[PDB]
Amino acid sequence: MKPTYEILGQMDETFILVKDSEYLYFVDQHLLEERINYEKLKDENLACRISVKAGQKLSEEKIRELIKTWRNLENPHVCPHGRPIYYKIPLREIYEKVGRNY
Amino acid sequence: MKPTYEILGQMDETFILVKDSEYLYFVDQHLLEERINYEKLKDENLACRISVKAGQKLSEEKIRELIKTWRNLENPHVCPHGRPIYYKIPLREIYEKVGRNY
Ligand SMILES: [Cl-]
Ligand SMILES: [Cl-]
Ligand SMILES: [Cl-]
Ligand SMILES: [Cl-]
Ligand SMILES: [Cl-]
Ligand SMILES: [Cl-]
Ligand SMILES: [Zn+2]
Ligand SMILES: [Zn+2]
Ligand SMILES: [Zn+2]
Ligand SMILES: [Zn+2]
Ligand SMILES: [Zn+2]
Ligand SMILES: [Zn+2]
Ligand SMILES: [Zn+2]
Ligand SMILES: [Zn+2]
Ligand SMILES: [Zn+2]
Ligand SMILES: [Zn+2]
């Protein structure tokens, strides 16, 4: 994700919505924290058990911290168990559907 | 869209993000206002020229009004020129990508 981005907020207390100029990302808060903790601790089970879970409301500050850290991870793409950390949609798919250039 | 929904906010001063239990919708603010005005005025060019344009910031109250009205339109799907008013993504596509049931 580009270093210029906009955080749109939380969805379903499960995903952080954040976009750059190319994509809107839906970032799984659990998988992201698990990856962050795994890269520090090198322990899959420990990283999992201490991380936030889906269904927990996060403060705006905590969300900012997580997204900033996400960009600097060695593997921002998949958790240590191989699950994709995020879903993404190209912004052009949204614009083009309604007839706008992007 | 179901009568129970959550407005997530504006994106790019162009789309209103709103979800129910099934889909996340990206609603084009211009096309929506144009449809609203067209259903009142029955005049395509007049409805277009008086409507908000992309790139205009909208207040939270104005966004609420538009989304409430959207649900009651005779045609909430396409503007009078035939363009889709919104893009939608099934929530299950987002959940399933990260390995979650939905
Ligand atoms: Cl979880
Ligand atoms: Cl900060
Ligand atoms: Cl921060
Ligand atoms: Cl426009
Ligand atoms: Cl109100
Ligand atoms: Cl209202
Ligand atoms: Zn362990
Ligand atoms: Zn686990
Ligand atoms: Zn886990
Ligand atoms: Zn901070
Ligand atoms: Zn995992
Ligand atoms: Zn006219
Ligand atoms: Zn026009
Ligand atoms: Zn128009
Ligand atoms: Zn109101
Ligand atoms: Zn139109």
CA distance A41 to chain B (A): 22
Rounded-to-integer distance, Cα A31 and Cα A85, Å: 5
b/e burial code for range B62-85 (CB count within 10 A of at least 16 → b): bbeebbeebeeeeebeebbeebeb
Q: Which of residues 75-94 of A touch B (CB under 8 A)?
A: 83-87, 89, 91, 93-94
Rounded-to-integer distance, Cα A97 and Cα B76, Å: 15
Structure-determination technique? X-ray
Q: Both tokens of residue B21? A: 């239990």
Q: Both tokens of residue A47? A: 């990283």
Burial of B47 (0-12, 13-18, 19+ CB in 10 A): buried
Q: Where are the domains of chain A?
A: 1-102
The answer to whether A17 contacts B31, with C-beta atoms less than 8 Å apart, is no
What does each C-alpha distance from B78 to A58, A94, A100, B73, B81 come to in angstroms?
Answer: 36, 15, 14, 10, 8
Length in residues, chain B: 102
Sheet holding A6-11, edge to edge: A6-11, A15-19, A23-28, A86-90
Rounded (5°) CA angle A9-A84-B12: 30
Rounded (5°) CA angle A79-A80-A81: 90
The answer to whether B98 contacts A28, with C-beta atoms less than 8 Å apart, is yes
Residue B29 backbone zone (phi > 0: left; psi -120 to 50: alpha; other: beta): alpha
DSSP-assigned beta bridge partners for residue A27: A16, A86
**A52 in B contact zone (CB under 8 Å):** no
The answer to whether B87 contacts A97, with C-beta atoms less than 8 Å apart, is yes
DSSP-assigned beta bridge partners for residue B24: B19, B89
